[PDB]
Amino acid sequence: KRYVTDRRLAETLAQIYLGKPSRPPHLLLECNPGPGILTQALLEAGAKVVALESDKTFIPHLESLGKNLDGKLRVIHCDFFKLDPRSGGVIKPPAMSSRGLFKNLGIEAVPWTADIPLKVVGMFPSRGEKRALWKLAYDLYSCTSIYKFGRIEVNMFIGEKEFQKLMADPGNPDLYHVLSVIWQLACEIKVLHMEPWSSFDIYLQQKLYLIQMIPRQNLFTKNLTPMNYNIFFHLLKHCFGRRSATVIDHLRSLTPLDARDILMQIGKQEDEKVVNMHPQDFKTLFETIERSKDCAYKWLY
Amino acid sequence: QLSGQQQRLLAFFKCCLLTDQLPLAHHLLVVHHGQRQKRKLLTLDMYNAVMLGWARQGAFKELVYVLFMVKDAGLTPDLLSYAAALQCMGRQDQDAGTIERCLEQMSQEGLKLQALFTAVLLSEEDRATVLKAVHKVKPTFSLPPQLPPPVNTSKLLRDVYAKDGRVSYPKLHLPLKTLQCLFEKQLHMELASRVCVVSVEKPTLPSKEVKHARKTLKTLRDQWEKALCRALRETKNRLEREVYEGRFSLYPFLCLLDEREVVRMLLQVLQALPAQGESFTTLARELSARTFSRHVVQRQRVSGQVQALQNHYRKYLCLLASDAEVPEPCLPRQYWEELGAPEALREQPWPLPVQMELGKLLAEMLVQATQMPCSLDKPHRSSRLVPVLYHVYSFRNVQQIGILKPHPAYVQLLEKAAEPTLTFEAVDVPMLCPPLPWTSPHSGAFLLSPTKLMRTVEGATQHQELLETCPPTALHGALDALTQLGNCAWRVNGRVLDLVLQLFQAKGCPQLGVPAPPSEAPQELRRELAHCQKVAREMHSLRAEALYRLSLAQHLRDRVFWLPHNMDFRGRTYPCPPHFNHLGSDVARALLEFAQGRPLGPHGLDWLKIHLVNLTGLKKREPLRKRLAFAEEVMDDILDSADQPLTGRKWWMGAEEPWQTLACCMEVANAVRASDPAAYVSHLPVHQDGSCNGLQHYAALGRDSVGAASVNLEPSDVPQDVYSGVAAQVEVFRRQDAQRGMRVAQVLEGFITRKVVKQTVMTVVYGVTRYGGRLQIEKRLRELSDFPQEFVWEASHYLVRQVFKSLQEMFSGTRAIQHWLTESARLISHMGSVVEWVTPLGVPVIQPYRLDSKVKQIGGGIQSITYTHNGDISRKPNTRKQKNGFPPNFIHSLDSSHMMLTALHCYRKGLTFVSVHDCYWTHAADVSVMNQVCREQFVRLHSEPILQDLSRFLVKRFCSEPQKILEASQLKETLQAVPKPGAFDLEQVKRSTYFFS
DNA sequence: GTGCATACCGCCAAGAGAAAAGAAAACCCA
RNA sequence: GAAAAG
DNA sequence: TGGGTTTTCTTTTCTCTTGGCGGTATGCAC
């Protein structure tokens, strides 16, 4: 949660946020627009922009001056990380639901496999890229919160630490983990911008970075369903629980099937480590188990 | 302290003593001769252990070799070395001149001949042998004669332990031979170490699949039995090889029990492992504890202690048996000690690392030894062998958790072949005989199994050593009260059992307390599946505990049984059998009744009637005459609820405690239909409870006239409640908040009652956070059906406020005593100490709350589990826990002392007394007498300056610092700053009708 | 006297298992 | 994750 | 002074910390 006052190369990021010049139905769900300088930079594009400010001190001015915009802003008081209630009684101004936000916008996307419905721009706080990064993946496989209706783009600022760890492969083996596997197959994440973190003011450090969180049609499969995902995750965390072991040892810890048979189904042969796994390799390890329909006992989740 | 490997070797030599494996101990002592790195680890205790071992065999050559080993490293021989030498010389029938030379050398070095017979902890066989060895040289030497046992002479315990008094101690309803037979039955149960009970679930009809799965499981279990045996002998030979070269192998620990018993125990823990598997360290701790608890019973079996226990017990039963008379009446501990007391030295627990490696070795060898065919669909099909158990992990935030989960085919085999039986550990079952009297903090409760005097979560514990440092007569009242509580014969109300088994076996009735089976459980899509799994798992756990309790209740249906009682660290008394006891729910309390009955007399029936109203929850705010008039008004409803419980007007289901009200309805229905109601012998306990006994004790300490009016210490015609008044004030603020812009006022309506603010107003004199009040006033609101589920959080925070607003300017002296106790605990914990105090009955109480727990790691094969030392190894007291714990722990010490005084003075009057915490149960004939005794003991407890005695004891204990007193003068003045007592006079409590009601 | 095997301790990354819903304020490390 | 007793 | 952490106490049933690498010290064969 940082209020950014820098206008530095805001036009370039606004144009890469804009995409096609002919179409302004694509909407920008800007998160924490405190000073409103980034709001004016996004208004320079000309497309419709919606703010989801959560702080009560900066919200009364945000409804004001919208008449000069002639209807280019619909201010809604919420925050992007909570949305769907988990242990919740009633509706409070800090947190609302996905149905309420999407009915206020009026935007509903019945098919997931069609074109992208919407775009979200946002940030992660100083502490908590891991928690909300976990949260978005949890929302992304089982369709929950912002990903509940459609395949919404979550193009947003990340720390450089994650962009080393989340884009890690068996190359650079020291920093490599489960969010890496989930996100690198979940979204096609490329290069956008590389501004310094300490350059942006806050109302010696790792440099800020910007990523594209765009989900892929290859995600949900006849074997990897959106409802079986918690079976999938308990592979990945367990396989990286002790990472200096063959995949046969972890399968015998996690599966009653013959692990060497599963490895001769996928191709790797009996010496092969969990650290020397690409993100697609875990998905293939998950889905080679499934089609053996005769063996009903498949997992130990 | 010694090193870890030093503890391993010391436990090794002790276990070779107890397994009678002396060549192995001598060999490993020889191997650590010739090096300095590990002979430095060898201390005088290990040499004394081998010294005593070669002494008990009568070996002299190895004896002299161990002596040369002790003198070779410059170590000085100890008292045990000369005691062992005299033992070996007595056993060998040594020439009297050489024993004379031994005694001259022993007296020459500086030994105390008189202290060796007393200070050295050694068995009576060793004592007899060393006594014979001395008396062959000095025939005129003799031990001092036994003194008469001491008598406690504290002021509160002066009337008890006074021989110049007229006593009538009650006697059991069972004769001497019957109690001897029950003693033999419980002895056989504790030797067997397990109990098999029939499940009270309705039996499934025999089928082809059921018996086929039964035979498959039996064949698999025989294969596993042979596999566990083979693996155990292969490990045994590997560890014996690893003993012949010098290493700690755990070989004598595996030789502590027979192979069949270890394989049987491993098969038992395989059988009792759930579908969701238990934690790996839990299996390790369980296997280590079961091995230790079976080794204890095996050792008393071999050593001849069982026969001595029998010979003492058949003589001890003459005090309690109705037909047998002692010459002088005395307490059970006094008759245990006046009779020739059998020797019972404490057996020390194993070192905690070695406990962990034994548990891990048994767990690993169970994991590796058991193998099942993977494809159970076709028996003729060739299938590879898969492990029965698997090492899964479970991750909770940072935490990595190792779990041994069974094979799903094995689980499906377990529920498909439904097992008609259930197995309990013998200490988890009520005793069939009267328990051993608590004569020490080491002897009591069960016959052969060690039972702790103070309950504790941790294995290593500060409470027991503090119980041993005190004078011997200090704990006499607490021990006699625990013995009196354990000496209450219990039986099962079979009619209530019949009705609960009627509802359990069919579709359950969830409102009465009888759980419903998950066959009746309910069966966006993922939300429905998640809700189904959650509800099904909750119902399954609830029905599992109900099945355990009902199976134990069915087992003890025709038997008179005893519940031995134990303490917590603050002094409250809990019965040791966990499932079926009178501290449980409404169903469990309805099942239990007294086995010995008393005639009602001229005032019995009325009390029963009052008790029935006390179980309805109606007429709670009325005088006793109004309660009795109500009971006479609803007498037909009582008779119909007793005669037709489930087929009639069903009045008893509307009671606050329905099954207890049903049992009391049956008792009243039997009593009023008797020919002479005075001559009706009644076994139903009648309960007297204190209205806010915390506030009662607080107002008794502070002498607050307003508080002693508010909670019934001042005489009055009507009962007084704080909950009703505070709830009325909250309803005033709710009506004030009505017809304004606040939705919660109209949402609440009539849901503000005594129950929703009961816990908070009860708690608040023990310092409660405003955040915890939300959780404290939401479960009561969540269980309401008419309450909307949307505004649970809103109404929770609405009841957090307007209660503390109502409680300001209230309980001034109580809040002052609270503040002084809290600041005393804060300053005691802030100077790096734990808060410690002595009760007025002499019990020492200390608080085990330390942060920054010391942790160690085990290197192993399957995984590495982390074990925590808490036996004073942690050196940082936890200030927040001490602050939040002292103001309730002091009050719990006080009402435990009140209960113990009431018990001890009711015992002298021939009363059967038991107690749930602040709820005193006795026969309906004796209630007034109990009330009378209770009031005096309250007046006797609170005539003593408990605040002032606590202050001067705290000054003596915690203010004696040589240099720290300069910064501790502030806590010195806060301990000397008890607020002054008010103007309430205690003998009025003697005339208080509704003190306990 | 030197190199290798063994055992012990530190120490950060654990993927700070999603609750980043929440009215509430005091305590200990930085 | 739930239930019960004080 | 700014920021991470817990929320009155006890007891019982159901069933919630491990792993990997690297550096340092120590003991033993040639």
Ligand SMILES: Nc1ncnc2c1ncn2[C@@H]1O[C@H](COP(=O)(O)OP(=O)(O)OP(=O)(O)O)[C@@H](O)[C@H]1O
């Ligand atoms: N949650 C609690 N925290 C602290 N002490 C408690 C708690 N619950 C019970 N106690 C202790 O148990 C006793 C109160 O038990 P109980 O449930 O009978 O309440 P009560 O207010 O005495 O009841 P009643 O007014 O209905 O007769 C007191 O000694 C009190 O200190």
Ligand SMILES: [Mg+2]
């Ligand atoms: Mg009470």
